[PDB]
Amino acid sequence: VFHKIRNEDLIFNESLGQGTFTKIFKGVRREVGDYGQLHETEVLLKVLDKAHRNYSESFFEAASMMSKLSHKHLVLNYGVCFCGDENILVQEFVKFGSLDTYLKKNKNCINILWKLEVAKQLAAAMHFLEENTLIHGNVCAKNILLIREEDRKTGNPPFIKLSDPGISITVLPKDILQERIPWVPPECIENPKNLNLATDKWSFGTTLWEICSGGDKPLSALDSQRKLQFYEDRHQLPAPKAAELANLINNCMDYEPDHRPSFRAIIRDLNSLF
Ligand SMILES: Nc1nc(Nc2ccc3c(c2)CC[C@@H](N2CCCC2)CC3)nn1-c1cc2c(nn1)-c1ccccc1CCC2
């Protein structure tokens, strides 16, 4: 169940981007904090498009997952607002935004150790979800948010969080699903309504490819029908320029779901790169 926040307390500011049938804006929330102190807190405001209110339940059940669980690497949900005849989620605002944008923007300044650390944090987050038998279903660099930059003076590493998954792939139309190849695994392309836990292991491999490819989008040059043919012909992604994680990527992107390794095994593999 969602803590109610008032339109009177929420201020809408600039657009921050788009998701599937959603728009996000930076916001300000007036609230009473610890010790009764008044705070105007930066917040993320996610709005389901009016033309697609049909997806409100999945849109809201997506965020509910992230409230029933608490973990250092999972975005917080503050609640919802009846901010007009409109369905709106109020969430944690992450200073430095999406990882895919950050990778592009700072490809020259990011080394393999920075990439390895972020991969470990994502894997730890996914391990937590696996242990709870929860399927995220939308793991991608765009949904990974940078809380904190590396501090080269002190050697302090970056810190990331995984956002909520958004509208489930089990209800999205096929044209959107195909656009999301190769994040959407092949077994979900042939039947979206049979999502298994193994889904996130495949998408984790794809996201790992983004991390090693400095923000590039794998298979962006292929249209939807060619992305389908990519799966039909059982192709694998090419080794990213930084080929350190190529074998882990292809091991996670296994066309047999049951053969994809546990996230415990993935973490030990990431640790064993030392
Ligand atoms: N929680 C959450 N904080 C935030 N801060 C955020 C958003 C945009 C920016 C920045 C921060 C940083 C500033 C700018 N430059 C300049 C310097 C650094 C980078 C970039 C702009 N973004 N963000 C989120 C983001 C998403 C979903 N959810 N949340 C999301 C989750 C599930 C489904 C769909 C979506 C919608 C899209 C992705």
Numbering used by the authors: 536 to 809
Which of the paper's sentences describe this entry?
JAK2, like other JAK family members, comprises a catalytically active C-terminal tyrosine kinase domain (JH1), a regulatory pseudokinase domain (JH2), and a Src homology-2 (SH2)-like domain that, together with the N-terminal FERM (N-terminal 4.1, ezrin, radixin, moesin) domain, forms the major receptor interaction moiety.
In structures complexed with 6, 36, and 16, a WT-like conformation for the phenylalanines was observed. This leucine forces both Phe594 and Phe595 to a new conformation. It appears to be possible to affect the conformation of the V617F region with small molecules, especially ones disturbing the position of the gatekeeper.
